[PDB]
Amino acid sequence: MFTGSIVAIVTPMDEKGNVCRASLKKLIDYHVASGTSAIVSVGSTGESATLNHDEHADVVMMTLDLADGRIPVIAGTGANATAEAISLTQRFNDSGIVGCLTVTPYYNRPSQEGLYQHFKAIAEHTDLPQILYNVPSRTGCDLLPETVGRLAKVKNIIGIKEATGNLTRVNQIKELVSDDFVLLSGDDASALDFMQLGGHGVISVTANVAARDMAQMCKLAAEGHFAEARVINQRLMPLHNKLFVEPNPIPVKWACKELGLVATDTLRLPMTPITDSGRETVRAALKHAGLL
Amino acid sequence: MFTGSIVAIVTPMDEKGNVCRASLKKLIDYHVASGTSAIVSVGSTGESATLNHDEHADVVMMTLDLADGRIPVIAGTGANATAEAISLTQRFNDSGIVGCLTVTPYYNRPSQEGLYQHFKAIAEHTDLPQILYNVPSRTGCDLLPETVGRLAKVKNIIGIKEATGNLTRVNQIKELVSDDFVLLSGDDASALDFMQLGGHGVISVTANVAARDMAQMCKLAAEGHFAEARVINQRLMPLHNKLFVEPNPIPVKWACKELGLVATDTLRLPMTPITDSGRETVRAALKHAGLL
Amino acid sequence: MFTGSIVAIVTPMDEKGNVCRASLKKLIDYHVASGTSAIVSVGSTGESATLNHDEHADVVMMTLDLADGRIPVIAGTGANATAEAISLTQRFNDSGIVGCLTVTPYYNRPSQEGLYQHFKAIAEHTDLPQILYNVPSRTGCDLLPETVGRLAKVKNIIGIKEATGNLTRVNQIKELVSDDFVLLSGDDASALDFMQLGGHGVISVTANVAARDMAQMCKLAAEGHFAEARVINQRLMPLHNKLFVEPNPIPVKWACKELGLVATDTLRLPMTPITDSGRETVRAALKHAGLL
Amino acid sequence: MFTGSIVAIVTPMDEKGNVCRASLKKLIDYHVASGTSAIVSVGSTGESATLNHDEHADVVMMTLDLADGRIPVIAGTGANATAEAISLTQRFNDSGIVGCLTVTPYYNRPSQEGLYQHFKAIAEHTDLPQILYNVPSRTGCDLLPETVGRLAKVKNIIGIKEATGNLTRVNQIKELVSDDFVLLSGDDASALDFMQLGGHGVISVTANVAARDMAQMCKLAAEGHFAEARVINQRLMPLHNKLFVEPNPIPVKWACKELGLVATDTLRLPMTPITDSGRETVRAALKHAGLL
Ligand SMILES: [K+]
Ligand SMILES: [K+]
Ligand SMILES: [K+]
Ligand SMILES: [K+]
């Protein structure tokens, strides 16, 4: 539910750019079959940026329905206005979702005090477990360990998706929070390293197309079998890197379509279709992972 | 008007975070009297992030009404979803605004081709002049001179607010675009340098509280009187820097309240009240500028 | 000899700026008593920058003499001219030193091919074991894992001091080199993390003044007792950070003098004496480590 | 002379890496004929890093001799040990050089106070004009405008080569120093911008192969004819960039050989020969500049 291989699942779309139920069902069946631990619905990889809150909610509810209790579902609930974050979270109160993934406000670059008040207010308006999400390269701000420690004192703030790729954050956060506070990687290429340092799992883009390998890798890591996990990691490393050859989720949607997991690789503007060079790069990575 | 001193105006709020018409009137009267070239309504400094589109539109309409033809108004129209940008833009068609200030999508980090398709589509569906807005520190993406050059070929894409603070961009862009394309600094501390290199004006935070000095500085710059402009710039430099001592528009709103231009310095979360240290810093800068 | 807690030992000086033998002897006795694994003589912390090659060699030979076979000594041999690196290394051929620490050329920013040819040529002119040293913040260049792998194929290139503080390098290098290639941290604040990921020890500044704790921490790490090691790390973390409050080795020399380990904290220009604020910061860190 | 186009001249070498007098003569004759303002002898581009001080001095003396009073010569005198800088400077006292170009210490990352004491001591022990040289990408430290202002008060500290490429530095420094203090760009690609902002000249790599165009460009810039200067700059821009496609001076030495200005393009390790791809890139840039 908040450990192991968690997929930041794509929102598959028809050619008109609306959610494709047949494709979503196929994806969710795949994750259940693959041993994926949970699904993050309408996170970054799910095109939270270009779905309105009604559409977002429709996808989350559809994902929950189709999951049919077989696999836990975490809703993306991020917003750069605290009022909007609260409103979006309230949509899922008493819904069946097991928790929320909520990103530091983007664009407006709040202070560490602002981040504290933001997440505290959100937490106060829900009984749902909250996973903080830090990704400075996308947001323009950086939720530092000290503030994470402050926020971990709030009862329902229970973990962090740390997407900096800065591995020193693992033990910096760990020393300031209780032993049951969950540390999850948001950076596929460093996620095994992140678990080797004490992290409890990954919210993963790669898991969209290598769900089985990712589940296996994280199980091995949790068991302390890092050399064995590393063999899998090495097979997946080109995907971990090349799934960001063009902006996420352009490559991973293409990959999903290539593997027959979704009907179309359609995205919403300003995401654009994969370049020819992109296709070949990603195809090479899939081949390296043994997925073709 | 798209040259000279253009204020990125604060959205003054009462204690409930709602727009304060009386305060907005005072500000607009102040800019009319002080020679400001135009008003950017609900840009970053106007808390675009935390107003919903309906509130956003209300503020722009209120600003047009209060302006009453005395000073041109430019609407902030940025969104990270191309469909949303287009929809927001339509709310202002035939409103009386003279143009739109439209930011590169934030958080989703589109490619250069993505940015091209975003702004092209926005421009296609309006007759209004469009001013592009690049601010990588906030958005996570960087609209490069090559792509600005492509976009400048679109009839109604007329200029750019360049907020990198990287002065090499001025002549990189200038050489790729027609001589009527407007280059506006979005970085107060480097704006005079930007104008000296070929820039046509500034969309300014400092202009909120030093409107007359900014207007004169920009006129002198336009006339080639850089040494004379620089004397004014030097007295404003502490403001140019310290208005960002805490997240914009926290400092400038406090400054406006201290001068009596607005009734309260209230903001919306995740912006929080200025710190005591911040007040001291900002106060000092106002005094250096001769404003208190 | 190339694992555990290795000290990048200061070059203690009299008030005239020349090596102080009495102080060097006291330091070396301290390291023997403390269980320090080896001594790096005239590395960065030893003011390699401001000693000429004759003076450098005198200090290395004095350190070797005073060690008297009780503790292995690694000579700093870095130079940004390959001819000079070769000449400096040749001074120590058949001397008693057990190996060399050789930094990527600084200032002239060679290519990865240049780095390869540099280190290959050096290795070819000596039988001594070579430890590569990467510290981009000081040198302006970055020896990447791929090139490390290339160089590890040379018989006497046997390890790396990785001072980037970028923990992802550990497993990137490890996968490209043989199992007996040594990975050492050059970044005290992340060194435990570095060992947790597979590193074999640290070449440490902190060990100058906390030799016992550092030895104990590294032993615990090598044994897989990371929680226990972490308790020591937490006690030392303020030193790990604050020993760079002013340029290394200004703080650590002051610390050594304060602990009675050296007679004077004299350095050579352009290093300047510790500031008053500096003194208090470092004193607080020593107190936190229980060393006062 | 400390204004206009100043060439950072290559140290031409035979196949053994020894200075080639015949090639150096050709280069000097070329700069005399092409209107270059002065020659910087054994700066970065002259492989200061890989000549020992005696060879360094030989090249400077040979350059004075060949110049034969026809063009002023500035000696590179930088060292990261203040005592060494002073000693090197004395080798040139009463030599006929008109001044020294002295870099911020590299690798040891001194404080601003350290830099102050370094350059003050150097200036004290010579009558020669000193030009400070700031290039953080290479040295690991950054001489800030405040400290430049302090140093400019020293009689014989007369100017600065500012190689950051950060154009805001021009007027930050200018406002802190007297009107006779010389501001010289050390970044070819931004040099015209630097001059437009108030800079007095450039210490240039590009001038090695486009001496006449550089001399005219700088004269036009000095006269305020920026649009006319910019046309020349645009034909040189590919060289300004691609002369750093591989580490300086690898590209410019190859370019000199291709034009027939020098007999061989040999460098000293850790510089290695230009790649085939590099040749292609550089060749293209020469052609764009009209030189081949
Ligand atoms: K909690
Ligand atoms: K246009
Ligand atoms: K080896
Ligand atoms: K002076």
Distance CA C186, CA C162 (A): 5
Q: Could you say which DSSP state residue A168 is in?
A: T
Which residues are near ligand 1, the ion (C-beta closer than 5 Å)?
A 157
Which of A52, A107, A114 is opposite residue B138, by nearest beta carbon? A107
Which residues are near ligand 3, the ion (C-beta closer than 5 Å)?
C 157
Residue with tokens 């064995």: A228
Residues from chain C that touch A193, judged by Cβ atoms under 8 A, are 167-168, 170-171, 197
- Report how far ligand 2's centroid is from the alpha carbon of B263 (Å): 40
Size of interface B-D (CB pairs under 8 A): 33
- Sign of the alpha-carbon torsion through A83, A89, A94, A98: negative
- D145 has a chain B CB within 8 A of its CB: no
CATH number at residue B277: 3.20.20.70
Distance CA A97, CA C118 (A): 58
Distance CA D43, CA D40 (A): 6
- Give how far B186 is from chain A: nearest CA, Å: 15
Task: State whether B167 and D171 contact (CB < 8 Å).
Answer: no
Q: Across the strands, what pairs with A131?
A: A101, A159
CA distances to A99, A184, B126 from A35, in Å: 19, 17, 50
Q: How was this structure determined?
A: X-ray
Cis amide bond preceding C247, omega within 30: no
CA atoms within 13 A on the CB side of C216: 15
Chains near D with 3+ CB pairs less than 8 A apart are B, C
User: What is the DSSP track for chain C?
Assistant: --SEEEEE----B-TTSSB-HHHHHHHHHHHHHHT--EEEESSTTTTTTTS-HHHHHHHHHHHHHHHTTSS-EEEE---SSHHHHHHHHHTTTTSS--EEEEEPPPSS---HHHHHHHHHHHHHT-SS-EEEEE-HHHHS----HHHHHHHHTSTTEEEEEE-S--TTHHHHHHTTS-TTSEEEES-GGGHHHHHHTT--EEEESGGGT-HHHHHHHHHHHHTT-HHHHHHHHHHHHHHHHHTTSSSTTHHHHHHHHHTTSSS-----TTS-PPPHHHHHHHHHHHHHTT--
- A93 has a chain B CB within 8 A of its CB: no
Distance CA C77, CA C156 (A): 15
Residue with tokens 């191309």: B82
- Report how far ligand 2's centroid is from the alpha carbon of D193 (Å): 25
Which of C52, C107, C138 is opposite residue D49, by nearest beta carbon? C107
- Report which residue type is found at A135: V
Query: Is residue D147 part of an annotated ligand binding site?
Result: no
Angle (CA) C256 C262 C263, round 5°: 130
- Give how far C113 is from chain D: nearest CA, Å: 7
Task: State whether C189 and A168 contact (CB < 8 Å).
Answer: yes
Angle of helix A276-288 versus helix A226-242 axis, rounded to 10: 170
Distance CA B242, CA A65 (A): 51
Cis amide bond preceding A110, omega within 30: no
- D154 has a chain B CB within 8 A of its CB: no
Task: State whether B270 and A246 contact (CB < 8 Å).
Answer: no
- C180 has a chain A CB within 8 A of its CB: no
Task: State whether C108 and D44 contact (CB < 8 Å).
Answer: yes
- Residue C182 sits in which domain range? 1-292
Q: Is D161 among the catalytic positions?
A: yes
Sheet strands (E) in chain D:
4-8, 38-41, 73-76, 99-103, 130-134, 157-162, 182-185, 201-204
Q: Considering every ligand atom, which ligand is closest to the CA of A157?
A: 1
Distance CA A172, CA A170 (A): 6
Q: Are A77 and A110 in contact (CB under 8 A)?
A: no
Sheet strands (E) in A21-72:
38-41
Q: Which of A42, A71, A45, A72 is nearest to A59 (CA)?
A: A42
Cis amide bond preceding B249, omega within 30: yes
List all residues 6 or more positions away from A85 whose beta carbon is below 8 Å from its beta carbon: A77, A78, A79, A102, A118, A121, A122
- B173 has a chain D CB within 8 A of its CB: no
Q: Is A219 among the catalytic positions?
A: no
Mutation target among D82, D119, D272 for the C interface, most CBs of C within 10 A:
D272
- Report which residue type is found at D24: L
Residues from chain D that touch B197, judged by Cβ atoms under 8 A, are 167, 193, 196-197
Of residues C26, C116, C120, C133, which has the active-site annotation?
Answer: C133
Q: Which of D78, D32, D13 is nearest to D268 (CA)?
A: D13
Query: What total number of domains does chain C contain?
Result: 1
> What resolution, expressed in A, was reported for this entry?
1.7
- C235 has a chain D CB within 8 A of its CB: no
Residue with tokens 């603070």: B165
Kindly compute the dihedral angle of the four CA atoms of residues D110, D112, D114, D115, in this order, to the nearest 10 degrees: 90
Query: Is residue B206 part of an annotated ligand binding site?
Result: no
List all residues 6 or more positions away from B18 whose beta carbon is below 8 Å from its beta carbon: none
